[PDB]
């Protein structure tokens, strides 16, 4: 039966490749017929010795003889034999290492230029992990824009800005615009109003929270005034007004006024 069939397999009757085969199966777990070809095939894609080169592909033949074109399937094969070991060199270790291992990979395979037809297909989405869930960080969400250009070269503007906001605030002005321009290197360059509606609803919390009880809203000012009750907080502007006047340096002179012109411009 499938019992005299496997007993026909008693024909192929390898121990090695046979065992290894079924072994590669029952284990990994399945068309008794299927893996049969499978394992064999990649076993052939191996190193030659004129007669093994023969028995193998020769029985590899008696195989198609079994199944008995569909042989495009021997392409769905290496396909993953690639994709796997492929994206294997995924997480940035591109090198001459990839270069190296890779080729040789497609070597013990068929694969015409199709290589690329995946080389990136992989490298491609290879990013779709990171820059997709760029949230779980922002320096990475940017790290995408870092390398997610290196290889591959919609609220995509949201993080773009958020990662631009958090990064910019923590973080010259116009060449850093080039850092926010790294964002225009992902999103449009006209979404400053999703930037402003994104950098405006931030200043507040500092106003609301710094402004609450004992000593200062001078801090929530220094950093929130790092942008570009009513007179009460205009006193933090008064507070540093003198507190800042901690040197009366040439600049201290100009940064104190316009700034105090901002809390003053952002009057109330």
Residue numbers in the entry: 903 to 931, 934 to 972, 978 to 1045, 1051 to 1067, 1077 to 1094, 1103 to 1159, 1179 to 1218
Paper excerpt:
To investigate the structure of Tic110, we cloned and expressed the Tic110 homologue from Cyanidioschyzon merolae 10D, herein named CmTic110, for structural studies.
Our structure covers residues 903–1213, missing the first 32 and the last five residues of the CmTic110C construct. Due to the low resolution, CmTic110C is assigned as a poly-Ala structure, except for the six Met residues. The region corresponding to TM6 consists of helix 3 and part of the loop connecting helix 4 in our structure (colored in yellow). This region is 28.2 Å high, much smaller than the 60–80 Å thickness observed for the chloroplast inner envelope membrane. In the crystal packing, CmTic110C formed an extended superstructure with tail-to-tail and head-to-head packing. Therefore, the shape and structure of the Tic110 C-terminal region most likely also enable Tic110 to function as a scaffold for interacting with other proteins in the chloroplast translocon complex.
